[PDB]
Amino acid sequence: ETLNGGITDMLTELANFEKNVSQAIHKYNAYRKAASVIAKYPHKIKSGAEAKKLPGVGTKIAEKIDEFLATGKLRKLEKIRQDDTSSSINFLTRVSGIGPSAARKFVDEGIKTLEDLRKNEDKLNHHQRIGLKYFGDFEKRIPREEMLQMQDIVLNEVKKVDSEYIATVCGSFRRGAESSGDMDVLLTHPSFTSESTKQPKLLHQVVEQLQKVHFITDTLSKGETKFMGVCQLPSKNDEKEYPHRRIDIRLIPKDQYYCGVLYFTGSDIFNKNMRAHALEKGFTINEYTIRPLGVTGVAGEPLPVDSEKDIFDYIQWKYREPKDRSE
DNA sequence: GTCGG
DNA sequence: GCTGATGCGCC
DNA sequence: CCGACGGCGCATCAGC
Ligand SMILES: Nc1ccn([C@H]2C[C@H](O)[C@@H](COP(=O)(O)OP(=O)(O)OP(=O)(O)O)O2)c(=O)n1
Ligand SMILES: [Cl-]
Ligand SMILES: [Cl-]
Ligand SMILES: [Mg+2]
Ligand SMILES: [Mg+2]
Ligand code: NA
Ligand code: NA
Ligand code: NA
């Protein structure tokens, strides 16, 4: 039981319908902003009107909140749940590497279930095949206890490649979450800055060492600065194995560490809303820089940054600890 | 879907 | 190959 | 067919 749990689950469910079925990404974003502001609200919502006062709730969402508050359900969602087609499209998007577009296509050709995907593996790309192979594993959360073991493995192996590397586990882990959806690792090295890429293969050396020791087991995508893949803790004899887990590693210029760690710590909705506040203050924020906004459209050169807090400072936000950036 | 130019 | 658009994903 | 909305890495396709 969470305070306005009913409402936020309804809106979250509709968000996912819009993104996955209607391919209406802004409606997705609207529903999520509403869910977010309502989850922050410290009172029980008693009407649509009350909700309408909040930023990002308008007429239509207020009417839905009135309906749900009177009846305990939403007709629109009942119909969507009874629609086999919608339900298949939505389910398939949960496979890593099947987005809304591929899900729709698969369903159009009558591929609607996990069994159907295994029968039509030849229709899937490498990434999708891996998402399917570990589907059950990727559904499951990682207890913090395991995240700590995984961190120890990563930091130790990284140190063995070169002790000038610094690896920081971000995402929900950094936000103090008791369980995590995956492992996000921010990487820096003194040879890679906004000025110069001096050393080649900097990210590659880490990935290959983590592969050598059989921690990283599969690669979904890979470039010079981002690794997206799979890893697994070692297990003991006749102990059942650990689930395979999703891992993301991001290599950021050392001199842009605070912008990177801010981005990688999230949450996602926090980030979008911090970046949104930046815009209405005449700045733009990415994982590399905070820049002031001109007029021609263009951003100006990066502003100096010496902490996560300095970024909040530019935009008139009081600092938020990582744990206070979750939903 | 909402908000604001 | 390029530029630009799309589809996958990340926080 | 009021348009903006947060921003970008990697992979792949279109029209050169
Ligand atoms: N668990 C199973 C069952 C059957 N098959 C085989 C038999 C067929 O050669 C092919 C599937 O053909 P179907 O058209 O029966 O499979 P569909 O998934 O299309 O049938 P449905 O309409 O029931 O979804 O795969 C399989 O690989 N695995
Ligand atoms: Cl939309
Ligand atoms: Cl920085
Ligand atoms: Mg994560
Ligand atoms: Mg996430
Ligand atoms: Na409102
Ligand atoms: Na997916
Ligand atoms: Na991740």
Distance, CA of A96 to CA of A302 (rounded, Å): 35
Domain A264-326 class in CATH: alpha beta
Q: Which nucleotide is nearest to A104 (CA to C1')?
A: C7
Domain ranges of chain A: 1-83, 84-140, 141-263, 264-326
Partners of residue A168 on adjacent β-strands: A186
User: Å resolution of this model?
Assistant: 2.2
User: Residue A23 C-alpha to ligand 7 middle, in angstroms?
Assistant: 13
Which residues are CB-neighbours of A110 under 8 A, at least 6 positions away? A116
* Residue appearing with tokens 């936020």: A8
For the CA of A116, the nearest atom of ligand 1: 18
Give the right CATH number for A84-140 from 3.20.20.370, 1.10.1740.10, 1.10.150.20, 3.30.365.10: 1.10.150.20
Q: In which order are the strands placed within the sheet that holds A216-222?
A: A166-169, A183-188, A245-251, A226-231, A216-222
User: Residue A136 C-alpha to ligand 8 middle, in angstroms?
Assistant: 17
> A129 CA to D13 C1', in Å?
21
H or E, element range at A144 = helix A144-161
Which residues are CB-neighbours of A238 under 8 A, at least 6 positions away? none
Which residues are CB-neighbours of A177 under 8 A, at least 6 positions away? A144, A326
Distance, CA of A114 to CA of A88 (rounded, Å): 10
Distance, CA of A111 to CA of A213 (rounded, Å): 37
CATH topology assigned to domain A141-263: Beta Polymerase; domain 2 (3.30.460)
Could you give phi then psi for residue A281, rounded to 5 degrees? -95, 5
Residue A2's identity, in one-letter code, is T
Is ligand 1 within 6 A of the CB of residue A116? yes
Which nucleotides of chain B are near protein (any atom < 7 Å from a CB)?
1-3
Distance, CA of A134 to CA of A307 (rounded, Å): 38
> Strand A183-188 to strand A245-251: parallel, antiparallel, or no bridges (unpaired)?
parallel
Structure tokens at A242: 């650990």
CATH topology assigned to domain A1-83: DNA polymerase; domain 1 (1.10.150)
Helices (H), A21-99: 25-40, 48-52, 59-71, 75-82, 84-92
How many beta carbons lie within 10 A of that of residue A258, not counting itself? 17
Same fold, A141-263 and A264-326: no
CA distances from A278 to A8, A267, A268 (A): 25, 16, 15
* Residue appearing with tokens 């997705």: A28
